[PDB]
Design a protein around this ligand. Structure first.
Ligand SMILES: COc1ccc(S(=O)(=O)N(CC(C)C)C[C@@H](O)[C@H](Cc2ccccc2)NC(=O)O[C@@H]2C[C@@H]3NC(=O)O[C@@H]3C2)cc1
Ligand SMILES: [Cl-]
Ligand SMILES: [Cl-]
Ligand code: NA
Ligand code: NA
Lengths: 99, 99
């Protein structure tokens, strides 16, 4: 698709068999999802946003569908105002910004 | 142009007579620039993200040249760690996300 930006670019994702809403966020290096259960081991990561740096859980090689496109990559889990799909997965679905 | 997302989508902007680097950010409702003076009236605002909230000054009707494309709108000024071009100005330059 071609998504204009008059409204938030919210899409449906599927992770762990569950549908969730997420924001397609070119200003995010990383994908961050609200508290949920994911399989496997995690590692620590500090990420910095508008209000400062926080701790999140990094899960690698997680299967996630984004607006119907399959991705397999790193998902960070922690407190966020909205689930955000960052560039690590936007590149896997072939997204670009155009003007 | 078509901007890929392998790297942060940074562009040059001109605002208040000054050249700055800023992130094209589809996950940002609003445009947020590091501390600088702008002319005209302003009012305080709180905006929030990962890490929490920051206080900013809201200036309306500010012209900003973004990668060579002029656009006018509200600009928030405050202690952001990165200059952010949000959707309020991305729409005006015709930016879309494509995949
Ligand atoms: C109302 O207007 C606003 C309100 C909030 C924000 S924001 O900066 O908090 N933000 C909103 C989302 C969190 C919904 C825009 C983001 O694109 C933000 C933009 C941003 C802000 C500050 C520093 C870097 C990037 N990136 C971000 O938080 O990324 C997370 C935090 C880590 N940084 C990063 O690149 O990847 C990690 C994930 C911007 C304008
Ligand atoms: Cl505006
Ligand atoms: Cl349009
Ligand atoms: Na894993
Ligand atoms: Na003004």
């Amino acid at each position: 698709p071609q998504i204009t930006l008059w409204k938030r670019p919210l899409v449906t994702i599927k992770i762990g068999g569950q549908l969730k809403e997420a924001l397609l966020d070119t200003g995010a290096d990383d994908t961050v999802i609200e508290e949920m259960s994911l399989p496997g081991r995690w590692k620590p990561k500090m990420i910095g946003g508008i209000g400062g740096f926080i701790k999140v859980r990094q899960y690698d090689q997680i299967i996630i569908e984004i607006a119907g496109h399959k991705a397999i990559g790193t998902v960070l889990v922690g407190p966020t105002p909205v689930n955000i799909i960052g560039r690590n997965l936007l590149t896997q679905i072939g997204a670009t910004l155009n003007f």
